[PDB]
Design a protein around this ligand. Structure first.
Ligand SMILES: *[C@@H]1O[C@H](CO)[C@@H](O[C@@H]2O[C@H](CO)[C@@H](O)[C@H](O)[C@H]2NC(C)=O)[C@H](O)[C@H]1NC(C)=O
Ligand SMILES: *[C@@H]1O[C@H](CO)[C@@H](O)[C@H](O)[C@H]1NC(C)=O
Ligand SMILES: *[C@@H]1O[C@H](CO)[C@@H](O)[C@H](O)[C@H]1NC(C)=O
Ligand SMILES: *[C@@H]1O[C@H](CO)[C@@H](O)[C@H](O)[C@H]1NC(C)=O
Length: 212
C-alpha cells in the first residue's frame, strides 16, 4: 500500500496504572505528505464491549480530545509519529486502541491492546495463625505462597502444609485484595517465615518476613 500504519510490535502494550502512556502509531506514506490536510483518529473499545468511542481526532486545521489530557502532537507528526499520549492512565482505559490515518482517498489503520496493571502492596498481620494481606493489585490472577528458612537447613523451603488462602476480593477502585493464612505451632528457634507474592506487575516477587 502507498499508505501504512505501524503499531507496537506484537500487538500489546503494558503499562502501570496511573503512568503517562504513549501508544505508538507511525505513519508510512510513499508520496510527499501534506500534514495539514491529513486526518488522524484514535478509537477505544473495552475488550468485552464492542462499543467503540473516539479518543482524539486530529485534522490539520483543528484537534479535539474526547478523553481529557489526551494528545497527538503536530510536532511529532513531522516525523510521521501519530502516537497518542494519555496522562495518568486508569484501569478502565485498558482495552483496544485503533489508530486510523486518512490521506484522501487512502486510509490505513492499526490496532493495539493496552493492558493496565497495578502492583500489590503486601503486609503481615501477626496479631498459631499469621496472615499476609496483598492489596490493590490488577489483574486478579495472583500466586501467594509461604516459605521458611530454618537454622538447620539454611535455604528456603516452601510451606504447603497448613496454608489456607482466602478468596480474592473486590475493591471499589477496580483493583483486588487477597489474604493468605499460615498456621504454625513444634518449631525451631530462629526460623524466618516469609509470605511471597507473585504477580504480573512485579519484576521480582514481593517477600515479607517475620520470626517468632
Ligand atoms: C484492601 O486492602 C486495603 C489495604 O489494607 C484496604 O484499605 C485500607 O482500609 C482501611 C480500613 O478502612 C483504611 O483505614 C486504610 O486507609 C486503607 N489502606 C490504604 C492505605 O489503602 C481495603 O479496605 C481492602 N479492601 C477491601 C475490599 O476490604
Ligand atoms: C505524568 O506527567 C505529569 C506532568 O503533568 C507528572 O506530574 C507525573 O508524575 C507523570 N507521571 C509519572 C508518575 O511519571
Ligand atoms: C496542504 O493542505 C492545505 C489544506 O488543504 C493547503 O492549504 C496547502 O496548500 C497544502 N499544501 C500543499 C499541497 O502544498
Ligand atoms: C525478606 O527476606 C528476603 C530474603 O532474605 C529479602 O530479600 C527481603 O528483602 C526481606 N523483606 C523485607 C521486607 O525485609
Amino acid at each position: 500500500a502507498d499508505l501504512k500504519v505501524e503499531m507496537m510490535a506484537g500487538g500489546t502494550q503494558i503499562t502501570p496504572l496511573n503512568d503517562n502512556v504513549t501508544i505508538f502509531c507511525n505513519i508510512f506514506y510513499s508520496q510527499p505528505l501534506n500534514i495539514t490536510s491529513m486526518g488522524i483518529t484514535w478509537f477505544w473499545k473495552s475488550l468485552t464491549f464492542d462499543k467503540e468511542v473516539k479518543v482524539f481526532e486530529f485534522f490539520g486545521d483543528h484537534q479535539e480530545a474526547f478523553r481529557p489530557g489526551a494528545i497527538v502532537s503536530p510536532w511529532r507528526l513531522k516525523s510521521g509519529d501519530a502516537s497518542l499520549r494519555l496522562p495518568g492512565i486508569q484501569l478502565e482505559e485498558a482495552g483496544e486502541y485503533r489508530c486510523e490515518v486518512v490521506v484522501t482517498p487512502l486510509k490505513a489503520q492499526g490496532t493495539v491492546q493496552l493492558e493496565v496493571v497495578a502492583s500489590p502492596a503486601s503486609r503481615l498481620l501477626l496479631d498459631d495463625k499469621y496472615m499476609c494481606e496483598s492489596s490493590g493489585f490488577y489483574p486478579e490472577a495472583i500466586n501467594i505462597t509461604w516459605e521458611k528458612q530454618t537454622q538447620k537447613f539454611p535455604h528456603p523451603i516452601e510451606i504447603s502444609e497448613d496454608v489456607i488462602t482466602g478468596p480474592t476480593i473486590k475493591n471499589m477502585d477496580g483493583t483486588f485484595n487477597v489474604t493468605s493464612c499460615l498456621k504454625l505451632n513444634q518449631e525451631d528457634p530462629g526460623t524466618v517465615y516469609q509470605c511471597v507474592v507473585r504477580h504480573a506487575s512485579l519484576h521480582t516477587p514481593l517477600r515479607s518476613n517475620f520470626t517468632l
